Write a protein that binds this ligand. Structure first.
Ligand SMILES: OC[C@H]1O[C@H](O[C@H]2[C@H](O)[C@@H](O)[C@@H](O[C@H]3[C@H](O)[C@@H](O)[C@@H](O[C@H]4[C@H](O)[C@@H](O)[C@@H](O)O[C@@H]4CO)O[C@@H]3CO)O[C@@H]2CO)[C@H](O)[C@@H](O)[C@@H]1O
Ligand SMILES: [Ca+2]
Ligand SMILES: [Zn+2]
Length: 541
């Protein structure tokens, strides 16, 4: 449901979407092809929903942190720029859009948050966060506040949380450990506690959003703020005398903002994949293109070497790059949106008092995971009681071993969990140059049909290993076909086993929102496990 011979673009409203629409005009004049530029709310949320059915825009613009998700779902076309073009752009920006061995998007510009001060109210901006209270007291007397920034988005408070030692996923040896999450470590709590204490002590209000803070600073009501390049335009229009310096340090260490890389990706359902490539390579990622945009609203430090050398003379851009170096670049992995949704809830609740810092950050670590209700796990994985629904917990590892994703799903819409997993892993289109191992923890054995498709799919993909651990056996009677289906899976190389306490214990700690409560085994677990183990042993002979 996407029009051919036309380009629709989605970009966020805080970017220079008018500047971009002009590049679409130049492009239209030189080709005849119309270029619509829309900027819907929550476009980053809307895209995956529409794109999954063959609708959506041809090009989507967002920071790169959300693209691994889009790629896993099979929503992005593979971009393929020649070696000549890849030279035009800084190497490290290409690395930000590298996922699953492919390039998934075109990098446009590097964004990072900076401290923005009013020279008239504060000629010397504070070097530490700890001054801000005394600074706010000194200023409150004159009818002004010291600092105002958006507290409704974790992006803006992340620099303070990350400073003392908070982090998203541990990065070591070039890879990300998705099981080592550092949102609740000592550092995180320290930085966030400072934030809350500012709110308790009446130096910041908890309800301050983006528009409120932007209006405060642009009317000279608050001495400082914290924002990105995109904000500079309206500060100019307001004729405030502003500087753009380094984010203050916390406990001696620098604030570590998450660095975004504005990126264009192409809808895999687009018929206009060529048009999009032509537009992005030869009209936007040029000198003329980026300027048209950067004049509407600043991009930061663009990815285009030629045009960046020119922009880097700006002292504002210098500070941006200084903060970016101090900080880290955002991971692009699918876990990132979950992480962002989680951290968001923490800062809001901790800031409003609904929770304590320690409590909020605890829940964040847990929420960022795909976790089951404990009642649902016990209700369904009991090896003695047969519910009429199937649950599947899965882990997907890479044999280099190293885990890429873990989650759970249940049968839905008359669609068995086995076929649902097949779609999820097909859509992903894993790099066939490497080897992976899929592990299922399922509550029922697979029906006969699904045993075909899983066997077919596995002979279709020699580089995948499947291990199924099951709680019960479905229709393993002699007047049923299912028992052979388990042999056919076994012959396709699949390791089938019955779950045991070790397995239930692992699942309890991995796929369940257990609240630290220890796994209590049910009466008949060890007996049922033993009985079934033999019953299976009898099937695979
Ligand atoms: O929870 C309710 C909210 O849900 C939606 O917000 C989500 C996004 O969908 C997530 O992707 C994520 O947002 C990240 C964002 O992905 C990340 O790039 C960064 O965004 C910066 C961006 O780099 C910069 O260019 C500029 O646009 O500012 C952005 C920050 O505002 O950080 C984001 C998170 O702070 O998480 C959010 C929820 O936090 C939906 O959009 C919301 O309307 C909804 O309320
Ligand atoms: Ca760094
Ligand atoms: Zn089935």
């Amino acid at each position: 449901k996407i029009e051919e011979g036309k380009l629709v673009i989605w970009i966020n409203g805080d970017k220079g979407y008018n500047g971009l629409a002009e590049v679409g005009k130049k492009f239209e004049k030189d080709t005849g092809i119309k270029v619509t530029v829309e900027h819907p709310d929550k476009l980053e949320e809307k895209f995956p929903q529409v794109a999954a059915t063959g609708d959506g825009p041809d090009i989507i613009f967002w920071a790169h942190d959300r693209f691994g998700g889009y790629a896993q779902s099979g929503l992005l076309a593979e971009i393929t720029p020649d070696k000549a073009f890849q030279d035009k752009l800084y190497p490290f920006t290409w690395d930000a859009v590298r996922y699953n061995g492919k390039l998934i998007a075109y990098p446009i510009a590097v964004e990072a948050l900076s401290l923005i001060y009013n020279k008239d109210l504060l000629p010397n901006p504070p070097k530490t966060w700890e001054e801000i209270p005394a600074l706010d007291k000194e200023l409150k007397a004159k009818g002004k506040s010291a600092l105002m920034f958006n507290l409704q988005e974790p992006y803006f408070t992340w620099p303070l949380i990350a400073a003392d030692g908070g982090y998203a996923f541990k990065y070591e040896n070039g890879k990300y450990d998705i099981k080592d999450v550092g949102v609740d470590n000592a550092g995180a709590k320290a930085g966030l506690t400072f934030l809350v204490d500012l709110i308790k002590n009446k130096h910041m209000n908890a309800d301050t959003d983006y528009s409120i803070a932007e209006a405060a600073f642009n009317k000279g009501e608050t001495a400082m703020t914290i924002n990105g390049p995109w904000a500079w335009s309206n500060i100019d229009t307001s004729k405030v005398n502003y500087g753009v310096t380094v984010l203050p340090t916390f406990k001696g260490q620098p604030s570590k903002p998450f660095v975004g890389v504005l990126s264009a990706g192409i809808n895999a359902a687009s018929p206009n994949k060529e048009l999009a490539k032509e537009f992005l390579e030869n009209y936007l990622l040029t000198d003329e293109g980026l300027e048209a945009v950067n004049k509407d609203k600043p991009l930061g430090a663009v990815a285009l070497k030629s045009y960046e050398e020119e922009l880097a003379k700006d002292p504002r851009i210098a500070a941006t790059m200084e903060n970016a170096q101090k900080g880290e670049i955002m991971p692009n992995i699918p876990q990132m949106s979950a992480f962002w949704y989680a951290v968001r809830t923490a800062v809001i609740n901790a800031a409003s008092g609904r929770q304590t810092v320690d409590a909020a950050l605890a829940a964040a670590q847990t929420n960022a995971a795909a976790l089951m209700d404990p009642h649902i796990f016990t209700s369904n994985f009991n090896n003695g009681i047969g519910r009429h629904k199937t649950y599947l917990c899965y882990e997907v590892e890479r044999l280099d071993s190293f885990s890429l994703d873990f989650g759970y799903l249940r049968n839905k819409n008359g669609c068995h969990v086995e076929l649902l997993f097949l779609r999820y892993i097909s859509d992903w289109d894993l790099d066939p140059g490497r080897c992976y191992r899929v592990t299922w923890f399922t509550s029922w054995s697979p029906c006969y049909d699904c045993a075909r498709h899983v066997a077919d799919f596995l002979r279709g993909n020699p580089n995948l290993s499947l291990r199924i651990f099951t709680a019960r056996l479905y229709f393993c009677e002699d007047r049923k076909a299912e028992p052979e289906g388990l042999r056919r899976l076994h012959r396709a190389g699949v390791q089938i086993a019955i779950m045991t306490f070790k397995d239930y214990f692992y699942c309890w700690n991995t796929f369940v929102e257990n609240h630290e409560r220890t796994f209590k085994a049910w009466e008949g677990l060890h007996e049922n496990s033993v009985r079934l183990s033999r019953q299976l042993r009898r099937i695979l002979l």
